[PDB]
Amino acid sequence: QAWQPGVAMPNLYKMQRMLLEKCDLQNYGENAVIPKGIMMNVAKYTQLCQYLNTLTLAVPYNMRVIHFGAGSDKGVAPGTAVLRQWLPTGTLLVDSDLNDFVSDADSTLIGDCATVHTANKWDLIISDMYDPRTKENDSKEGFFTYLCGFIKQKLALGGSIAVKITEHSWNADLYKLMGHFSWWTAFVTNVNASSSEAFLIGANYLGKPKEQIDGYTMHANYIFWRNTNPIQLSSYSLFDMSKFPLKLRGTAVMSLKENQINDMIYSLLEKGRLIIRENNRVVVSS
Amino acid sequence: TVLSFCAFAVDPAKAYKDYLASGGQPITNCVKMLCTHTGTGQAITVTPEANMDQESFGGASCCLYCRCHIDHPNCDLKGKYVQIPTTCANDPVGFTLRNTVCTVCGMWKGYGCSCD
Ligand SMILES: Nc1ncnc2c1ncn2[C@@H]1O[C@H](C[C@@H](N)CC[C@H](N)C(=O)O)[C@@H](O)[C@H]1O
Ligand SMILES: [Cl-]
Ligand SMILES: [Cl-]
Ligand SMILES: [Cl-]
Ligand SMILES: [Cl-]
Ligand SMILES: [Cl-]
Ligand SMILES: [Mg+2]
Ligand code: NA
Ligand SMILES: [Zn+2]
Ligand SMILES: [Zn+2]
């Protein structure tokens, strides 16, 4: 386990019908496992991408990736730098944040994410959006409501997402939407394991329910898992970068109509063998 | 304040140099990548290419003009990775400012490059 890039929420815990409790975890601290001169976020996104390497991600020849919450108080985009390192060369990487920052992405969109418009669909959405949080823990709106609509309207069938949540920063519709993927999990990176942070990862988008997920319940389930399974911080996976970049899969991209999307096509989408979207010119707004 | 100090100088690169000579801390939060350290060693590359004697940084975070949000004099760094000699890695922005890439072998003059 200490060798893994992190820990995924086991199926046993996804199946429960837990009540919502408080989380017994402190999001902060000086981090004893981050190697010298390395930012937490480089380490964190590295492990996220190491995890994504183990999944059946679709990887078109002309991949399109959009990154929300890419900026930081430092003024730089460490996560974007990792994405840019991970993804195939000349993959379109677009990133975005509420405040200005410098980026290694092809485009950088400044402003509230609700101002971000595009006609084109994406193969991968990464979000690290976060607002630092009242005596109740309810589904949070804000960027999450935009995100859910974004996913529903602009994620290509076959595409995948990774969205940052914590104890208090989570959304019920996002959890529900996880059941529209061929597979999903909540993934905790090993370098930040003592925080309540996880990435909700949906793998291979299907555009329709596969499971009925109740958001509120699943988040209680998430908390229960975290409370009763402490994870020892670890950066073991950081010390072998040799196989890091995402595999060039050459995943077919096809523009299909709803009536062409039959059982064998869904089966292809489920296995990460197809992306469905147009191949038009990509234009992104303020 | 170093970013402002340079942003509002007629010659930002000179301004940075003067800033250092007077005991200012080098610009921080240059983005060090995790990498193999088995790369080509070249100065500016599509992906991390640090060799055993280098570090790889995200290019934009190592660019004075990017960091200061000012006009470039030309960006050669943004969207790319810059290899920087471990001994100089405390100041990646200064390094790229003071140094020049060889146009034949693609390495840093006085560092990785060995030629005539
Ligand atoms: N509504 C919003 N729209 C756009 N960005 C937001 C919004 N709310 C929070 N954010 C951003 O979420 C970011 C959270 C950061 N911790 C992200 C760090 C960054 N991923 C990194 O690599 O270091 C902040 O930069 C916020 O500006
Ligand atoms: Cl890997
Ligand atoms: Cl549920
Ligand atoms: Cl195929
Ligand atoms: Cl398109
Ligand atoms: Cl200098
Ligand atoms: Mg599968
Ligand atoms: Na319910
Ligand atoms: Zn620049
Ligand atoms: Zn040379």
Residue numbers in the entry:
A (entry chain A): 3 to 135, 140 to 292
B (entry chain B): 12 to 85, 90 to 131
Provide text from the study:
Nsp16 is unstable in solution, and nsp10 acts as a scaffold for nsp16, yielding a stable dimer active as an RNA cap-dependent (nucleoside-2′-O)-MTase. The nsp10/nsp16 crystal structure shows that nsp16 adopts a typical fold of the S-adenosylmethionine-dependent methyltransferase family as defined initially for the catechol O-MTase. When bound to nsp10, nsp16 is active as a type-0 RNA cap-dependent 2′-O-MTase, ie., active only when the cap guanine is methylated at its N7 position.
Soaking the crystals into a Sinefungin-containing buffer captured this MTase inhibitor in the SAH binding site almost perfectly superimposable on SAH. Binding involved the same residues and contacts as SAH. Inhibition of the MTase reaction by Sinefungin therefore probably occurs competitively. The Sinefungin amino group quasi-isosteric to the donated SAM methyl group indicates a cavity where the 2′-hydroxyl of the capped RNA is expected to bind. Lining this empty substrate cavity are the residues proposed to be involved in the catalytic reaction: K46, D130, K170, and E203. A good alignment (170°) is found between the SAH sulfur atom, a water molecule present in both SAH- and sinefungin-bound nsp16 structures, and the K46 ε-amino group. Sinefungin exhibits an IC50 of 0.74 µM, 16-fold lower than that of SAH as reported by Bouvet et al. Preliminary examination of eukaryotic non-viral MTase structures from main classes as defined in Martin and McMillan indicates that the SAH adenine is bound tighter in any of the latter enzymes than in the nsp16 SAM-binding site, indicating a possible breach to achieve anti-coronavirus selectivity with a small molecule inhibitor of nsp16.
